[PDB]
Amino acid sequence: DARKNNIAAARAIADMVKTTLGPRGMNKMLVNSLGDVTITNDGATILEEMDIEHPAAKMLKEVAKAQEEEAGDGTTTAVVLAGALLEEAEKLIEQGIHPTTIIKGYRKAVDKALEVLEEVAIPVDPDDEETLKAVARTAMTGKASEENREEIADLVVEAVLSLAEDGGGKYRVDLDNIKIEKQTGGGASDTELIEGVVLDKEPVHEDMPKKLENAKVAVLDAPIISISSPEQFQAFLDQEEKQLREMVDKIVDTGANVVFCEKGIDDQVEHMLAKKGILAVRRVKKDDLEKIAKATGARVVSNIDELTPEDLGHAGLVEQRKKGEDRMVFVSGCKNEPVATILIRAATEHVVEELERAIDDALNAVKAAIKDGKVVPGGGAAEVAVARKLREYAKSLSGKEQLAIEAFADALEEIPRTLAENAGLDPIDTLVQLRAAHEEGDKNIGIDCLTGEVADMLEAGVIDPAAVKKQAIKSATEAATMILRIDDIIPAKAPT
Amino acid sequence: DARKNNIAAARAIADMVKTTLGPRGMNKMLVNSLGDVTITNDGATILEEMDIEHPAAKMLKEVAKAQEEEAGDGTTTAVVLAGALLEEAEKLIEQGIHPTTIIKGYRKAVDKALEVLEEVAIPVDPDDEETLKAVARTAMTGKASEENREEIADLVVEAVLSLAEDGGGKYRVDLDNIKIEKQTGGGASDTELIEGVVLDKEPVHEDMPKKLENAKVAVLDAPIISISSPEQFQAFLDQEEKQLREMVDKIVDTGANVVFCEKGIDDQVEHMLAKKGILAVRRVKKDDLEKIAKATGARVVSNIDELTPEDLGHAGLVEQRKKGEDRMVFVSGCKNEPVATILIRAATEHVVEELERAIDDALNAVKAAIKDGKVVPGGGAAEVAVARKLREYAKSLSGKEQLAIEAFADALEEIPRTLAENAGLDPIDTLVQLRAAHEEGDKNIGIDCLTGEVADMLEAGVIDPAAVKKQAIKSATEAATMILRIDDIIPAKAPT
Amino acid sequence: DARKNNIAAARAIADMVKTTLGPRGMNKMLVNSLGDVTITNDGATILEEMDIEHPAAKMLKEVAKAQEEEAGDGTTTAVVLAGALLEEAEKLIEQGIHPTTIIKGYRKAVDKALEVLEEVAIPVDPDDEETLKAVARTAMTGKASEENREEIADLVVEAVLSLAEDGGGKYRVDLDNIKIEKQTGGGASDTELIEGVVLDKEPVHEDMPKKLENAKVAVLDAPIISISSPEQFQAFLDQEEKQLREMVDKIVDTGANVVFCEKGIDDQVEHMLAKKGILAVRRVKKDDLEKIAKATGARVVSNIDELTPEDLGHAGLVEQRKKGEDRMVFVSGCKNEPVATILIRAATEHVVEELERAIDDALNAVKAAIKDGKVVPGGGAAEVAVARKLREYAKSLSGKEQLAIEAFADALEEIPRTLAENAGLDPIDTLVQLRAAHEEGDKNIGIDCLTGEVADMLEAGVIDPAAVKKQAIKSATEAATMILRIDDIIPAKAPT
Ligand SMILES: Nc1ncnc2c1ncn2[C@@H]1O[C@H](COP(=O)(O)OP(=O)(O)O)[C@@H](O)[C@H]1O
Ligand SMILES: Nc1ncnc2c1ncn2[C@@H]1O[C@H](COP(=O)(O)OP(=O)(O)O)[C@@H](O)[C@H]1O
Ligand SMILES: Nc1ncnc2c1ncn2[C@@H]1O[C@H](COP(=O)(O)OP(=O)(O)O)[C@@H](O)[C@H]1O
Numbered sequence A, B, C: 001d002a003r004k005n006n007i008a009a010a011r012a013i014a015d016m017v018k019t020t021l022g023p024r025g026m027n028k029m030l031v032n033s034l035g036d037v038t039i040t041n042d043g044a045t046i047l048e049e050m051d052i053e054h055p056a057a058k059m060l061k062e063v064a065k066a067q068e069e070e071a072g073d074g075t076t077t078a079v080v081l082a083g084a085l086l087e088e089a090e091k092l093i094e095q096g097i098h099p100t101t102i103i104k105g106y107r108k109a110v111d112k113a114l115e116v117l118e119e120v121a122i123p124v125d126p127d128d129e130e131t132l133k134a135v136a137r138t139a140m141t142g143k144a145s146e147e148n149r150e151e152i153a154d155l156v157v158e159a160v161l162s163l164a165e166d167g168g169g170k171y172r173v174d175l176d177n178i179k180i181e182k183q184t185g186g187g188a189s190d191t192e193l194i195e196g197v198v199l200d201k202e203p204v205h206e207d208m209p210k211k212l213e214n215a216k217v218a219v220l221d222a223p224i225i226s227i228s229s230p231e232q233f234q235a236f237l238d239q240e241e242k243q244l245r246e247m248v249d250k251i252v253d254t255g256a257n258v259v260f261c262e263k264g265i266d267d268q269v270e271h272m273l274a275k276k277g278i279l280a281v282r283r284v285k286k287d288d289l290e291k292i293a294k295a296t297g298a299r300v301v302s303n304i305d306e307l308t309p310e311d312l313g314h315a316g317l318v319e320q321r322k323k324g325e326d327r328m329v330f331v332s333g334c335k336n337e338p339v340a341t342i343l344i345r346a347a348t349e350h351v352v353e354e355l356e357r358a359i360d361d362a363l364n365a366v367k368a369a370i371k372d373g374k375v376v377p378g379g380g381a382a383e384v385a386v387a388r389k390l391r392e393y394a395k396s397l398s399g400k401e402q403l404a405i406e407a408f409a410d411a412l413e414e415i416p417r418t419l420a421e422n423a424g425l426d427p428i429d430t431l432v433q434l435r436a437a438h439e440e441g442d443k444n445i446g447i448d449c450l451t452g453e454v455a456d457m458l459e460a461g462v463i464d465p466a467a468v469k470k471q472a473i474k475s476a477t478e479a480a481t482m483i484l485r486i487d488d489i490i491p492a493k494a495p496t
């Protein structure tokens, strides 16, 4: 039963990532043969860099990548939903239903599930500050320490509003637009709007002018013998420094005094650069060099011979500040576009990476809420409500598709069970309580794992974007369907 | 039970480092495949250069590093506290409490623990000499020999006061500021204020002027053929020596006569340097070369062609003294900044390293005491007091968090048990005596392992800074929490 | 029980060195992979070039090195005392005393032991010739044949008195100051004051002037092609011969006629040196070249171009004497300083090394006696006396430290037991006889292994300087303590 094998692999992955769904998600550790260890709880990373020999499991890589690409939040929800769906799919094949009937029933169930989630979702305007804060805190939940939730949420909404580039209603709040720097120790209170891309590199030369107001900023990427007579070596050195003098002279004619180069340097090169007072940062990556080019306004000039004064950018200020331990050039005053890198502070490296992922997910969720403008109660409330209306449809429908739709409802309801289990509550009792609550007509009662009870989510500030849950259901459906659609593993000829 | 496995690894490390907590810390022996052996007892080394295949253990490296970075003392206290915390956490999970409840209880317990430690701590002014001496002796405890405790403590406080750079109240008593030199044999009575960085290297040339008052000191870092005719090789040699004459002549025009170079030399080079009477020390590291540049005032000149008289430093004296066995240039008279290296004398190499670590910890603790200005009774007194008030909080609180807080109290109380056990006293009897003593209202009764009894710590001069114990509790909490939050071991994809 | 494992290793080394303590020290053989063998009985070597994979035993390397550095005698006594101390410590931890109590007791015991040895030591003037001879013979004991004891003792005291450089009371009788040459066969009667460093090298050329009274002695260290036309290589040879003539001409202008070079020579070089009658000895080591430079007064001149008549030294005589088999230049008449090498004659190579070590130890002992001027009766008498007064202290003291002090007394008394065992006497009977004697009030009764009885050491000329025994006790204490303070072996990260 190769299908049983594939389902078992998907089940193993689903159970592995089940434990990391919620505020109290028990983190997982990623150890490799090199010995490096990273503590993470966002399921994206967990599905990213885990060893999977099984190819049916290896499809869930692509499922998670699609989820992150469209939605940016809800990979763990999608994988757990796929696990529960394949649970009930397996034991529906055990009863005797053909797999194609299961697929057809799941397709109908998920069409109606998306419709129901559209109906139940409560709308939100982009000016109700408390609702945006609630969305931000709910998504932000999972990975930060409990202390700095209010602070990071406040900074999230502040950055989203202040950097709100009104591009015809759809604000272009990109992940690489908001200004944070990474550094060990200190705290998260350095996630402020510093109008420029800050590089974690020291100045090459001490007497290099650290302060330069209205500096003429340039962006470069190029890397900055036969001897016959005794003085011929000195001659090659002389002409090399002469052509260096010529090129830096025509650079200075443009007026450039601040440079961030993509490649390395040499001691003599940086010395003669600092002779005139020129900043030079080396080994800047492709992505962050492009970001600096966008921010500073100086177009990247591979062939520097055609550099002109028109090609140069400008920055309001450049300053070297000894913040914390590491020395860095705190560039501030890049006035053309809001451009930045996803680099964020915390106490330790594990917490640094955790907070980086968490702030990224926070901006993703608030961006989705602003764009789509439909928010659904979280904490398992949406799942239970959709399961109830699916059971109503099952009462409407008849045949052996009703069994498949009931299976889909139970698989959807497995998410609140997991969310309660990770919170410490007993799963069956609180699940029955949620069902009883939703049978009384109200639809916002869920699970809030911070207080460890069942309560109204809307008054508890536990609300997730509608589109995130829609894409979670869709990705789980495609995962379960296309894992069910396989029959048997065969050796495929390797491309030569 | 991968969580049980990780708890077991952490409890192996905790029990290994348990024996080295106190004045009578039974030292540990680190042996490597190369066969080199160093004897230490300070926990930082033991956590630094031990082998750990276990990844959950490998996190405790990062915990210890963070402890050292912020505080610089209390790594052994942090690890033992983490061990006891995971002991009680494990026994709480066998009872049946969910891990997340333990995490929440520990968080609340540790918030109140930091608050309690804030209240109980007795304040100190920076002029009560006996109190500073007591703090210095308590921190110096563990590693220095019993005989020279008074001597090294006196020198510690003398150096701290005399080199007290009043930078707006916060004295910049850095570890690389106080003047000691390393040498085998002799004694610790050479930890005196020699106003300059002393290098453990002999003069290159005998007739090099050993004494130079008000010497013009320079700092350098640069390293100091086709033949056709009979005399082409000789002409090449003539040109190389000629350009050597020109560069050393424009050096002499500046007036430099004392140099400490970062790189090697040659016999002809050292000779023609000594021809004019120029000192040259080779293979100076990056850190100590930067220290020499800061002390002497001569900026490091990579491109020596631009060296000017303005670029040269000055030193009151340079002298070669045949102190002990090794010949060294005892540089003295660097008048710009207080800069030095952590190099200290003792009898044998093991005692040399032990004394170096001890003096480093001593300046760390006195610096922390001067900065924060809050001292707490040591010898387990602070732990017992905080445990008692935590039990009072437990009596106040109700629920299954009371069990977690009682667990935290027991784990905090484990430290005095360890300190008594290493001192030779029976742990249960003396712990009960400490609890009874704290139940009578007094707060300073602890364990003093020098006298091997229970006595007032304040009268015995056994007092640690408040901040070191605050960070010990915090780091132990973070370690226990983030080790509890792990679930399973999964193979992670190695980055290509 | 890793501490038991370290104690066992220390016991193994202690027992392996035990047999070589005393005049009748049964020697030890050092066989290596290369197959070379050296017969030694002095403890320094048997601790130096032995394999010790065990790290706890590897500490005893450093213990022996420290002992040799400070005292240079009594390493075997120190290691045997450490073995006995750890013996009784193993007994006491068997009983149940905690190790820290043992350490404290040993510390107090050894403080009082040093005090007791100070009280009991008999003073010596440096003019009482018989006492100095007795001290010299006592230390010189251990290694030589029985025939040449009086002889070598007489030469030792004669050299010490005649080369007595009165440097403010502390005579600088260094090991590298007294004149002996090494040569196979003959006898020890060539240990005479030959006022100059004698080199074991033949003259390069026969017609070199073997006799040169008031010779102008120099000291050097420097080591003494494209073809176009047929005469081009001849031009190269002519010019090289021309600069050779130039440098040797400006050498002769100074007047140098005797040279001892650090590096090799060539046949043409030595031929043209002997053309003018210049002595040249090659492959002179760094140490002996520096010694020759000090003795002859000719400073070592790396760059010979600056050699002047003022830079040349003078020697009263240089002569080639065919003493024994090997041909050597018997340099005699270096009038500046007393400087020499530790090279001594005997019959065979094993015996040559044996008397070399023995004369070194003899000079160290008489130097220590003259410096400190306090001598204590050897032959186990000092150990028994200190043990008795330690037992008196034990009777004074009360508690479980009394057991540790009794342990120290027994470990200290183990030395006379070993000294009797190697002499052939029964250990317990003569030990009891010594104890009974010392209970009668006399303090000089010991063991004399030459006569193989128990007798008064002062009339038997068996006396070993007090500082040697003081350092023996101190090193044994530190070794035993810092071997007891270890708990367990752990693998250490190797430095990359
Ligand atoms: N404050 C909260 N209390 C209870 N449940 C929450 C809370 N915030 C989020 N959740 C639940 O966690 C789910 C998202 O979990 P998360 O692990 O953050 O997703 P991802 O791993 O994809 O980022 C939501 O669907 C919601 O049901
Ligand atoms: N003189 C003393 N007597 C008894 N206990 C002491 C004494 N000095 C320090 N301690 C205890 O040792 C603890 C610190 O131990 P130590 O090993 O020096 O820490 P670290 O290994 O982090 O440097 C203190 O918190 C205190 O309880
Ligand atoms: N003539 C002697 N008769 C008996 N015992 C002696 C005599 N000379 C020395 N000893 C004993 O030998 C001890 C020194 O032994 P030795 O092997 O010379 O030490 P090391 O090996 O360190 O040089 C002394 O402490 C003394 O007790």
Ligand SMILES: [Mg+2]
Binding pocket: A073, A074, A075, A139, A361
């Ligand atoms: Mg999420």
Ligand SMILES: [Mg+2]
Binding pocket: B073, B074, B075, B139, B361
């Ligand atoms: Mg400490």
Ligand SMILES: [Mg+2]
Binding pocket: C073, C074, C075, C139, C142
């Ligand atoms: Mg000896």
